[PDB]
């Protein structure tokens, strides 16, 4: 039984392809609109905040980098993380996951149905949401659990806060030792023959082998890295965008896993933040379009002068 390869457009006609496309688009729109009211159908009970509580995170998109100015005159550079479509997919109990914290699975931006596997498509069909690109697991406390299918917004974080940003860094492929490890090269022109960038000696004569920790040319860049303690300066609620201080690992337009800072200096700033998550349908009062920090020079400013 020599079965041949197939795809979704192989057997469709010139008139059914637009029909299938629009049918899937309408289904995705309806599914996304069904979840816009997570607090009125059957939300899970909300627990009070505790000193040792941990919150869920988001999966945003690294848009770009923008300058920003502080009221004291300094200039920082911020990265734009846009929460396109962030949802809670599944929940895993603490004893069944780690024995210390529960696991909440969070999915990022939407992708096409026609290029996902049967198991993934079935899982998203049972869940009731269109497939996501990036899926991550967050370790939260049992009092911060959220019902799967709940959307998440950039208002989950607030201006003035420290966050941890995890992403796959820009992959530079098989790089030489000089760029991978910062090794100094051999001199350029004083007689050296074909050794201007070689690592040189790699071990010792007596050992008669090279140690497992030897720095040698290889892959560089396409690995997961986390930046710790990035300050949040600004929140654009209309477009769901976070202005995080400094640089962010990964290329632009990549999926970025963002969560609260785990450094000991910023352990208990979860008190003033919305503990379970941000529910736009609960307060019954729209947030401002832009929420700024106490030191950000807003675009509409009196053109600060020193006294």
């Amino acid at each position: 039984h020599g079965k041949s390869v197939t795809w979704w457009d192989e057997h469709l006609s010139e008139e059914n392809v637009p029909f299938v496309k629009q049918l899937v688009s309408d289904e995705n729109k309806a599914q996304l609109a069904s979840k816009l009211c997570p607090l009125k159908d059957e939300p899970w009970p909300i627990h009070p905040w505790e000193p040792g509580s941990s919150r869920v995170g988001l999966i945003a998109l690294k848009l770009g980098m923008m300058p920003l100015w502080t009221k004291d005159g300094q200039k920082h550079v911020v990265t734009l993380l846009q929460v396109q479509d962030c949802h809670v997919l599944k929940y895993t109990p603490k004893e069944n996951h780690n024995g210390r914290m529960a696991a909440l699975t969070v999915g990022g931006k939407t992708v096409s149905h026609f290029h996902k596997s049967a198991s993934i498509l079935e899982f998203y069909q049972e869940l009731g949401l269109p497939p996501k690109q990036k899926v991550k697991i967050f370790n939260v406390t049992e009092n911060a659990v959220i019902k799967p299918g709940t959307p998440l917004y950039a208002a989950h974080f607030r201006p003035g806060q420290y966050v941890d940003v995890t992403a796959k860094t820009i992959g530079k492929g098989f790089q030489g030792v000089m760029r991978r490890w910062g090794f100094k090269g051999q001199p350029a022109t004083h007689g050296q023959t074909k050794t201007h960038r070689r690592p040189g000696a790699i071990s010792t004569g007596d050992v008669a082998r090279v140690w497992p920790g030897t720095k040698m040319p290889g892959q560089l860049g396409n690995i997961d890295r986390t930046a710790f303690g990035l300050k949040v300066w600004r929140i654009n609620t209309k477009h769901n965008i976070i202005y995080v201080n400094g640089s962010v690992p990964g290329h632009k337009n990549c999926l970025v896993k963002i969560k609260d800072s785990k450094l000991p200096a910023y352990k208990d700033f979860c008190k003033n933040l919305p503990f379970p998550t941000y529910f736009p349908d609960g307060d019954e009062e729209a947030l401002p379009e832009d929420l700024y920090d106490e030191n950000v020079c807003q675009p509409g400013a009196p053109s600060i002068t020193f006294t």
């Binding site: 057997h11 469709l12 006609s13 059914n16 049918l23």
Partner: protein
Amino acid sequence: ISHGRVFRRLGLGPESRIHLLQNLLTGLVRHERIEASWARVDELRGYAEKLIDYGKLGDTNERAMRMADFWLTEKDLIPKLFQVLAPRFQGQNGGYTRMLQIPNRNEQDRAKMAVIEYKGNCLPPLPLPRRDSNLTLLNQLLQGLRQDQEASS
């Protein structure tokens, strides 16, 4: 590390790549359909589209005239470019060229070949890959689903 590179290296350098591209473009403009290596034709497709755009830009435009003069090595094709190709591409926007992969060459190199062709020319049509008819089983099921959608709408 070649992130964000749009032009592939061909020939003996950038000038050699430009000369190869202009030879291919002259052949394409003259014959209305040529075949070559897949990479060279893929590179040439964009230049062909931009040349048709420059021809649509006008005969009296000095910039377009100089660009055509440079790119068309045979000088008898510039009147053809400005009086045949551009008149028949007026309502269109970017669908000027058609590129299709053909079987590899017969000789030992076995290169991957493509054929590029200005649309609406005076040549036998290529064996274009046609989609299935609505009379197929799956297409008929989709048609019935569409009919019920329209009825419920």
